[PDB]
Design a protein around this ligand. Structure first.
Ligand SMILES: [Fe+3]
Length: 274
């Protein structure tokens, strides 16, 4: 066991999934830090260094990392793989990004199985000496992710179907909402320039009041102020922060992808009174 195969990912969700497949034969690091905004992140010379010293670079595609393709052109002789191949996208419904794929496909546990299979194939292709370990680790992790779905689905099914309204800041939860039958309301469709401007706020306020939606949420890499504004003006309680674009630090409450799905689903269910 000389030097461990080095994998660099764009953000922390992919880092944790890939580290579970790599096990102890590879080290996986994320370019963005926990808590950092990933859509419009601005790479630094130190990020170039990290990616250039990798053996494999992983990214989401589906229009998530607006910075990645310009950044990756600075990198020489390091293979890359997009980990969303074979996932059927949901389009962004409005705004300047309307009609393109919604990137947040990892918020569906079923989609996470496809992430695992793509990351496995990329590790096996570019570090073939350890293929048996990658294959074993992916089979074990896919079994955890597969089993994850049933208890989450049952928990959210307790919410009456006609009251299943997921009101968030970024419209980052479209794939989770589809899986579990939630109608989706958000202050902005995807992180970009306009985030909490008027028109956006008042539309969400109108849908809340008409449907008596009991809770509204923010997310961990953006400001909580628009959601708290919405809850102050309506009957909705502020449900807290959901995790989608970033894990927490390893010593925080959301250190893993499994913990992220569990925490987001639990926070939603609590927002509805379980
Ligand atoms: Fe996002």
């Amino acid at each position: 066991t000389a030097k461990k195969f080095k994998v660099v990912t764009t953000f922390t969700i992919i880092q944790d999934i890939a580290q579970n497949i790599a096990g102890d034969v590879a080290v996986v690091e994320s370019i963005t830090k926990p808590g950092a905004e990933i859509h419009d992140y601005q790479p630094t010379p130190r990020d170039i260094v990290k990616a250039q010293s990798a053996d494999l670079i992983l990214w989401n595609g589906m229009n998530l990392e607006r910075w990645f393709e310009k950044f990756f052109e600075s990198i020489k002789d390091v293979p890359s793989a997009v980990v969303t191949a074979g996932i059927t996208p949901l389009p962004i419904r409005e705004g300047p990004y309307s009609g393109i794929a919604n990137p947040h496909a990892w918020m569906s546990p079923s989609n996470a199985l496809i992430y695992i299979e793509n990351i496995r194939k990329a590790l096996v292709e570019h570090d073939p000496a350890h293929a048996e370990t990658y294959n074993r680790n992916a089979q074990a992790y896919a079994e955890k992710i597969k089993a994850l779905d049933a208890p989450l689905r049952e928990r959210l099914s307790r919410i009456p179907a006609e009251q299943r309204w997921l009101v968030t800041s970024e419209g980052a939860f479209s794939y989770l909402a589809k899986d579990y039958g939630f109608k989706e309301v958000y202050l902005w469709p995807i992180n970009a320039e306009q985030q909490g401007i008027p028109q956006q706020v008042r539309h969400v306020i109108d849908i809340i009041r008409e449907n008596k939606i009991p809770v509204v949420f923010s997310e961990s890499t953006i400001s909580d102020k628009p959601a708290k504004q919405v809850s102050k003006e309506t009957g909705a309680q502020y449900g807290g922060v959901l995790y989608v674009d970033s894990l927490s630090g390893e010593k925080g409450p959301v250190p893993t992808y499994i913990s992220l799905i569990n925490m987001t689903v639990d926070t939603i269910a609590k927002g509805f009174g379980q």
